Amino acid sequence: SGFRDFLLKPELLRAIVDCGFEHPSEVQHECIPQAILGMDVLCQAKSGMGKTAVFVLATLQQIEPVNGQVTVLVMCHTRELAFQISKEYERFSKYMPSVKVSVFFGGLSIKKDEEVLKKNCPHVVVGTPGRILALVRNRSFSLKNVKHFVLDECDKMLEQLDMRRDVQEIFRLTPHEKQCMMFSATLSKDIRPVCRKFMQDPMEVFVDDETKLTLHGLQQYYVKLKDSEKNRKLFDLLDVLEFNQVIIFVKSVQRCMALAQLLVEQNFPAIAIHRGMAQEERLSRYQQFKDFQRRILVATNLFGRGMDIERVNIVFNYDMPEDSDTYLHRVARAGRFGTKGLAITFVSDENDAKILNDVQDRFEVNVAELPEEIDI
């Protein structure tokens, strides 16, 4: 419905349907209308906000495939994200058979990559900058037809001066007349001027800037609990906080499955989603949480990659987040629109307490020690 208002090709609309998406995310409303007009884009958005689909959809909307011509180049820092982005291109081009996507992150030898490039002639190339640069240096393909140049994890790529030089050398070999879009889950204030030097009057979106402002309105508590005390305290808190939608973040896939199982055995309506599950399964489980029976989602980081995860009432850090960016991104979903949110963090050791202090220091908020009397 709302995607139709973007004026996307019917082939893209049909693929968006098949992917189970109902309406555009907030980041998509902000970015897609101008991205499909060729405007440069600088966008920071955390996982699970529809960020990847902004550039996949906008570049597929504009692409005019010519055999032998790479017209879309997408690069990122990690092999796994390059692989996952290539799969997102496959899902959204389901009804665009003329579009060919290939990915190059080092999984094959450089000679095998050269063979794939010459045989398959992709119009969309995804990869990491080291391998892309080596392939162009060896004349395995040409960058002279690139019309869309996209970076993801762009802060990782441009911080590391090694990769920044490779990115610039690749940028130099593309036409000056091109659309440039850069995405990242995090964008420090220091890295934004660097990104801007590659662009022309870009539209800019920084989700975390807004999240850092609303954070003072979020009720945030911690509980000092070693591991062996976490379940009893959690079970007790979940009893008093009934009729709320809750996400519980844990640090690993097996802790995710086990906690959700223990919760279900304890008669809580919980479901597990971790970042290793396939998209179709993550979507199916997430629909149960957002629309139907499940009130508690046990999750790892990145459980909602490629999806649009709505706000909830309460967020638990059952296991401490690894840094303060991760804390911010986890608790940002606490508080449904126009209501009060609650974040509760389990602190088990001194390293945990260190992170909580960096959190309170960086975002200028107080994470109070949770009381031990009635919650009103």
Author numbering: 13 to 388
From the paper:
In humans, closely related RNA helicases, UAP56 and URH49, shape selective mRNA export pathways through the formation of distinct complexes, known as apo-TREX and apo-AREX complexes, and their subsequent remodeling into similar ATP-bound complexes. In mammals, UAP56 has a paralogue that is 90% identical to URH4914 (also called DDX39A). UAP56 forms the apo-TREX complex, and URH49 forms the apo-Alternative-mRNA-EXport (AREX) complex. Each helicase selectively exports a distinct subset of mRNAs, including key mitotic regulators.
The folds of two N- and C-domains in URH49ΔN41 are essentially the same as the apo-UAP56ΔN42 structure. However, the N- and C-domains of URH49ΔN41 were located in distinct positions from the respective domains of UAP56ΔN42. First, although the amino acid sequence of the linker is the same in both helicases, the linker of UAP56 did not have any secondary structure, while this region of URH49 showed a clearly oriented α-helical structure. Second, the relative orientation of the N- and C-domains differed between the apo-UAP56ΔN42 and the apo-URH49ΔN41. In addition, UAP56 M243 and URH49 M242 on each loop were directly interacted with UAP56-V224 and URH49-C223, respectively. Although the amino acid sequences constituting the C-domain loop are identical in UAP56 and URH49, the C-domain loop of URH49 covers its own ATP-binding pocket. Although several DEAD-box proteins inhibit their ATP binding by intramolecular interactions, the arrangement of the loop in the C-domain is not observed among other DEAD-box proteins, suggesting that URH49 has evolutionarily acquired a unique structure to repress ATP binding. The crystal structure of UAP56 and URH49 in apo-state showed the distinct configuration of the N- and C-domain, probably due to different linker structures.
